[model samples]
Target chain A: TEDVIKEFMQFKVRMEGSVNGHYFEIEGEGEGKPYEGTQTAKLQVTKGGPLPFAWDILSPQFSKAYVKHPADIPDYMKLSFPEGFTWERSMNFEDGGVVEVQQDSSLQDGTFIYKVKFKGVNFPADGPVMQKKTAGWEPSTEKLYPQDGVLKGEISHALKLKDGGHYTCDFKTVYKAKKPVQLPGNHYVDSKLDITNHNEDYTVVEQYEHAEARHSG
Target chain B: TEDVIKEFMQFKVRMEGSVNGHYFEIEGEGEGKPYEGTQTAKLQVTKGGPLPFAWDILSPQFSKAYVKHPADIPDYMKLSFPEGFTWERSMNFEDGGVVEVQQDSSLQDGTFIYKVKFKGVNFPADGPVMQKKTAGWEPSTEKLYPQDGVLKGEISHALKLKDGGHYTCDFKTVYKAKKPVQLPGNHYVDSKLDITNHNEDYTVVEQYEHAEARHSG
Candidate 1:
């Protein structure tokens, strides 16, 4: 059992940060009715097989992307933001760009302070959902432990239609690694791929196992 | 010795793809001599602590960034690109946008047809490097194995200064994991940081181990 670590030096690290009933509320006028959805968040990483092991994480990016919204909203709706949204109210989809480990004080609480902020990060253009947005994390009291860390934040968006109509999204989310699993046996490599195709539709994820590795001397 | 693996569940994976030396050439008339530098590239990844392990690699990104080069270059320079440079000629700094495993065929010759292309990928603007560019990779002939895999490609650029002056960079690079080192001990978490500040200065990498972890049951 001890040699299991040596047999597979490159093991996987899975810590699930589950969402705690995020609230999404929309308030539009003349254009359509307010809508809401329970948005869930997920994160994963890849590790190197060398020492000083490096892992891939999301970075802050600014883009002029477009997103098509629901049947009720405009087909080519885009997100809107004020000036300096990248720095002031940055946004990180796919995965939370805010990654910091409490391993130093692994089991401790409230000693580490970090933040997750996205203030109506516009679509750089306009072809998406919502118009304005807001989301966050509290460092003062929140902990980021694998066993029992809590994350509280808000994420909302608003969009104005060219047809003199508009839509808004106001969501409140709580993220915690609620379900942590340690799988048996190590394999050649593992991956948490973001094959979302990054469209304004349902996120897509598929996994497959190579079914063998029989080698000996 | 085998018990060493049991001590640390998270280990590092290191493979080196060394370069056989890339070339850079340039030609300019009024503005300045086409400046040239044998540009070198590096890559790194992070792993998880679970089965079916995973690693983080650079994905394709479309960005409008700014670069302030040396004293000989412009101060507030930016990259210029043509129509759809994102798809036509993707650019990835910090790391690479191309990452594939050789473990499946970890030890084999050419059978891959991957490509690395960048055609006169403008500065996205006209502030920095040269006036034009070109680069490539041939998987039909080149392999991606750790011990014998070889990567051949080219990356060149050009820039037309405002005062009828101009500069260019015609570089040809050869990449292969040559200095692979598997680190000792399994660490809590490892990282390959781009603390480059993402600026136009020397790439900076500083590593410091947490001095200790003394725990007993």
Candidate 2:
């Protein structure tokens, strides 16, 4: 009976936002193996800046899972969902774009929210691609749990990076969790969550520039 | 059994040194309550130097007591006399003279040595008595576990103080433990350490001078 449930479990994640005046998107898929599995994705940043740039999406490492009831789920799992239960995902990029998200479910409101933050953003420099120096930016969020199996929310971010570069973004996101399919023999369900976001209005407030020394004529 | 041992305990500490070619001395007394009680004393610095000045004898505070086992007749207590055992005393002054000593006994040698150091030494300044900036100085000592129920030693020190003042001296010390006449219960034994150092040979290695700025004279 346990073998049937082990063969069919899945997890999913998705995120979308804007940088500068361009569109940004990410998607992830994984399994229900407790804290040992991973959700991976490819990030796409639309071209609209002074210089073309790309990001190499990294694997999202799984941290932990919380459950609502032990008797309702398989004995091998840690926690069940009723709402407010949360899991973590850490996304690292080769271009120095580091982001993390906490995925939480709200059973009372029947919704889920992603609390997210960015550590660094990459930019083209005279040397190699330089990571913008960050003072600190407020965490962004997408909220209002899915009523039809799709969670949705919107975000606006105004941030300053090193070397006088500033950016502002406004975007919306949608997330969907696939219904758990019952496997043969065991009384357990396997499921996955998918997410995506889009922005029609993004803006770059300032471009980085080097200061030149002054001389009296 | 406890009463017999209580009738025979003692504590002692002493230090004598020089400051700017002038004479200085200190003595302390206390009992066997391991690092709990205090022994205090007054300190005196004889007249001499750039100005006529003297200090009130300061009290030395006792900290604790330690002991070595088995009676060897030739024995040692505010600081107990026993090999491998030690105690401490701190002397604070109105003129900011802060000094401390560690009283240690070695049963193998049947002798007690006082490891001493000074935190500050006071000298009359334009404002109040200013403490000299001390780099460091050699510790003076008193020795020989008294077979006649006493402890004693001698010391010589040469030291420097901040503001370019220096002092050197030679001195001797004696310690005695007072037997507890009434001790079926709890009060501690009394003891005293006496110190006196004088020198016609004492010399000042340095003299203090004020720095003046130049104005293109």
Candidate 3:
């Protein structure tokens, strides 16, 4: 019995990401020592109205979350990057802080991709605010703004790591504003962020790092 | 829908105390602006032992943790001070930590005298020994001696507070080593902790202040 327990492996640790002014979800299996059982994970994203408005913008009903059974994962499972809700740890123009996203993953040989729209907002000086810590810096406060159309990007699964223990994916996207907006009195609007995916080669190690760097840089 | 939502309440901040050397459980009900609900809390003791002999030595368990629900408690809930598993934050005693026995009033009113003992241990020293912080304390590398019997004490449940909120039971107890034993290499050999219920009554307040003044004097 003890030997059998020792032989079982476990999966734990789920993460998520999304930019401010947007909503995303992250779900995944638990992380721990190996176990003789089953596990699954899921994620969802919903569409919301245009941004750059100084009010609560509810998430659209399109977003969702899900997980797969170990038996369901084919031996040749492939996974792509930027498919679900993802928040960046760092911003393009903002230095010293990374954005955050939430999601889950597993080893397989299938491709996956994700896309999102960008929006901005400008709130009153004494407006309602929600605060959360980001990166290693102090929590940053931003004013709400309206929609800025969408940014689009694609992720490609690629076998690009030296050791067979890595997963890699590629991404590309751009954002456009609905109007030439100006930030006033310490109020700033966030740019739209869109993401896309095509290939699901997740065995490459530097996939996430490479995609994040290439997208922001 | 409003009736269904009526039972839901926003989580509120809580403050309470624990028994020294003895294990105890707590449950309560309260109401705050815009909501009301009941909450229960338990303080667990995680030390070492094989039972009988385990409880006597007063060998400390490490740190204390608070969980929100009773159903969420670990399966080892009823374990003795040194026999289950210990945590990191509840064992700082070089400063103002006290150990003692407590009596439960509710149990007494219902015709029973419930007793609990408390003990403490620090980290990097107990669970996983961190090489850098070892300084002089080490739990795993050190050998622990055994003891013979259980610690003893009394209960008083009617101590009320000025704000009309009060814990129902209170009592005193004394715990001693069942057998005199040599402590291993500077590890804490023995301790006599005195626990008092702070939210109980003005009597406890006066007694605590007197003890403080006397200790200082």
For all candidates, the clash counts are 73, 42, 105
Restricted to chain B, the TM-score per model reads: 0.17, 0.28, 0.17
lDDT of each: 0.19, 0.29, 0.20
DockQ of 2: 0.01
Off by over 4 Å in 1: A1-128, A131-195, A198-217, B1-117, B120-143, B146-217
TM-score of 2: 0.20
Per-candidate interface DockQ score: 0.02, 0.01, 0.01
Evaluate candidate 2 and give its CAPRI docking class based on DockQ: incorrect
TM-score of each: 0.18, 0.20, 0.22
Model 2, position B169, has a per-residue lDDT of 36
- Angstrom error of the Cα, residue A41, model 1: value is 12
Worst 10 residues of 1 chain B by lDDT: B135-144
Pitting candidate 1 against candidate 3, the one with the higher lDDT is 3
Please report how far candidate 2 places residue B48 from its true position, in Å: 83
Question: Can you write out model 1's per-residue Cα lDDT over B1-217, one digit (the tens) per residue?
Answer: 1221111222111332211121111111111011111011222222211111111111111011111123332211011111111112223322122222121101112111122222222123223222212111100111111122322333333222222222343323333332332211211111111111111121211111110111111
Q: Identify the leading candidate in terms of DockQ.
A: 1
Which residue segments of model 2 deviate by more than 4 Å? A1-8, A18-22, A35-63, A66-77, A80-217, B1-217
Q: lDDT tens string, model 2, B62-125?
A: 1223322223222234223332334343444334444444444332232223433333345334
Indicate the DockQ of the complex predicted as candidate 1: 0.02
